[PDB]
Write a protein that binds this ligand. Structure first.
Ligand SMILES: CNC(=O)[C@H](Cc1ccncc1)NC(=O)[C@@H]1C[C@@H](C2CCCCC2)CN1C(=O)C[C@H](N)c1ccco1
Length: 183
């Protein structure tokens, strides 16, 4: 779409186990860990990261590649979200996400979550927000922009952040990084 937005990963939110491309456009789970600052922003608990970008208004679209990725988590979230210590990922916290785990088991971050029934495993996912509309939707690029799922009447109060994770590499097959597409 035209409402496109150039997103960079904020390393001041990145979980210590995550390696970033120097361009802030990839992110993947490292076997070992980084020994980095004591920021009130970093995700301690799980392999999660935001994008530096802050939306207070308007309509914003971006795309993410997940070729060869048995799991992942994409979407948006409030700044407000607490960044310290275990939680449930849900609209209820301040996350409007979808995700994948165990290769073929896609679900939406409703409280509680909602299994999804997808004609075509998406190779890239398109994410789209309309702050004023209370809207954020997920589109299956690899199947002619088919709506994977839409969150509606979200309560968009404070500012909003692009949310990501490449998920866990236990299976072996989650080496591959979330790659942001250039459009
Ligand atoms: C019961 N909730 C679940 O089973 C879902 C399942 C799920 C799996 C994959 N992708 C998103 C969701 N987990 C969560 O909501 C959170 C986030 C998640 C992370 C973050 C994304 C990357 C790696 C996985 C693991 N997770 C916890 O461990 C919370 C924990 N059980 C708890 C409940 C109360 C307080 O803490």
């Amino acid at each position: 779409h035209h409402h496109m937005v150039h997103i960079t990963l904020d390393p001041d939110t990145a979980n210590p186990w995550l390696i970033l491309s120097e361009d802030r456009r990839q992110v993947r789970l490292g076997d070992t860990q980084q020994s980095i600052p004591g920021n009130e922003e970093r995700f301690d608990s799980y392999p999660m990261v935001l994008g530096a970008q802050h939306f207070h208004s308007g309509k914003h679209y971006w795309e993410v590649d997940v070729t060869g990725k048995e799991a992942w988590d994409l979407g948006v979230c409030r700044d407000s979200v607490r960044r310290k210590g275990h939680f449930l990922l849900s609209s209820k916290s301040g996350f409007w996400t979808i995700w994948l785990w165990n290769k073929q088991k896609y679900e939406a971050g409703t409280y509680p979550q909602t299994p999804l029934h997808l004609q075509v495993p998406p190779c890239q996912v398109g994410i789209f927000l309309d702050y004023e509309a209370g809207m954020v939707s997920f589109y299956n690029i690899t199947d002619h922009g088919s709506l994977i799922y839409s969150f509606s009447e979200c309560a968009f109060t404070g500012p909003l952040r692009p949310f990501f994770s490449p998920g866990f590499n236990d299976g072996g097959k989650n080496t591959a990084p979330l790659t942001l597409c250039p459009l």
